[PDB]
Amino acid sequence: QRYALVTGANKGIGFEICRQLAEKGIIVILTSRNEKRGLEARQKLLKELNVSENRLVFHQLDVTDLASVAAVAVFIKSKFGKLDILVNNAGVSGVEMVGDVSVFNEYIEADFKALQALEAGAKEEPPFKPKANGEMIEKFEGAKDCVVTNYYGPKRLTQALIPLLQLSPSPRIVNVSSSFGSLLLLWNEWAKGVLGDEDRLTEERVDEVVEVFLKDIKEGKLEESQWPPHFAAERVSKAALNAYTKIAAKKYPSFRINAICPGYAKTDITFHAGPLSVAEAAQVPVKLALLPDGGPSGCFFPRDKALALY
Ligand SMILES: NC(=O)c1ccc[n+]([C@@H]2O[C@H](COP(=O)([O-])OP(=O)(O)OC[C@H]3O[C@@H](n4cnc5c(N)ncnc54)[C@H](OP(=O)(O)O)[C@@H]3O)[C@@H](O)[C@H]2O)c1
């Protein structure tokens, strides 16, 4: 029997990851930071799956709360004795909208277009201002929450669950990153060199990058910095997550540890805009959670590359 834990699973992609793994016969620990939302999610999904009660287990988990993280490791040890699959799905954007919320989608569309141009060799990210009457507000508190959730969360939960994952015959970690973690989007030349220098990459180096970013947004104005012009904490945190994916994969070679982008999908975080359904999005992390032994590890896969892997 295989056991999978999914973070941020009361809604969105994480809820659908739980569905798709459970349909494979994997026993899923659906976790969520709010107990009521998670219990209700478990009830709804058990109904929709139409399977017996033991196929889906709820446990509270806030990935920014070190006691919460420790407690779920104790629970898994006592109830199951091992873990086979960890999906680090929980995430936040670091952005507060003012005015017309579809401005969030305007910036997403602009940044995918910019990434395509940079991936094709363009040297510069085009400047962007939105059309509709709204703006993305990026403050220190949001950025800190974004970094602590998106980067420290997966790192700390990975570290807490290593002893249980080591008892699996095929240990799997999937980190739900985003395409906006590309170093092409990160702007900061020091940080791009650090996160890109794989032979010198350590957890200490990545922690240092994100802490310099947070100090910069706290203490001054990012427009004067060499950090990104917008989605700054999203970019930094997801780049840091991708780097930690590589660090962990090298440290735990018997595991397969990968980062993915699910594609642009309709969830609360995107105001339910984007071309993909939430079921379509979850296909990507599920694909890497079921990767056969010997497959790639330590990598970042965007959607189409992920789905083509086998
Ligand atoms: N949708 C897209 O287009 C897209 C594209 C690329 C990457 N992603 C990534 O996909 C992941 C899932 O987001 P989504 O699109 O499914 O959005 P979503 O519907 O907003 O779901 C986010 C989930 O994360 C949970 N969460 C947030 N902070 C948490 C914390 N401290 N501890 C535990 N759970 C926490 C949320 O819980 P609450 O209900 O309590 O807030 C919710 O369950 C994120 O990591 C995001 O960066 C999404």
Residue numbers in the entry: 5 to 314
Question: What does the article say, verbatim?
Answer:
Three salutaridine/menthone reductase like subfamilies of short‐chain dehydrogenases/reductases (SDRs)2 from Mentha piperita were identified, namely (−)‐menthone:(−)‐menthol reductase (MMR), (−)‐menthone:(+)‐neomenthol reductase (MNMR), and isopiperitenone reductase (IPR).1a,1b MMR and MNMR catalyze the ketoreduction of (−)‐menthone 1 a to (1R,2S,5R)‐menthol 2 a and (1S,2S,5R)‐neomenthol 2 b, respectively.1a Additionally, they act on isomenthone 1 b to produce (1R,2R,5R)‐neoisomenthol 2 c and (1R,2S,5S)‐isomenthol 2 d, respectively. Interestingly, the three Mentha SDRs have high protein‐sequence identities (63–68 %), so we performed comparative studies of MMR, MNMR, and IPR, to pinpoint the determinants of ketoreductase vs. ene‐reductase activity within SDRs. A key difference in the sequences between the ketoreductases and IPR was a substitution of the highly conserved catalytic Tyr residue for Glu (238 in IPR). We determined crystal structures of both MNMR and IPR, the latter in combination with NADP+, alkene 3 a, and β‐cyclocitral (non‐substrate).
A sequence alignment of the three ketoreductases MMR, MNMR, and salutaridine reductase (SalR; 45–49 % homology to Mentha enzymes) from Papaver somniferum L with IPR showed each enzyme contained typical SDR‐like motifs, such as those involved in central β‐sheet stabilization, and a TGxxxGhG motif.4b The latter motif in the Mentha enzymes contains the motif TGxxKGIG, predictive of a preference for NADP(H) over NAD(H). In some cases, where not commercially available, product standards were synthesized to confirm whether ene reduction or ketoreduction had occurred. Double bond reduction by IPR was seen for six α,β‐unsaturated cyclic enones (3 a,b and 5 a–d) to produce the corresponding unsaturated ketones (4 a,b and 6 a–d, respectively; Table 1, entries 1–6). No ketoreduction was observed with any substrate tested. No other major changes in residue positions were observed in the co‐crystal structures.
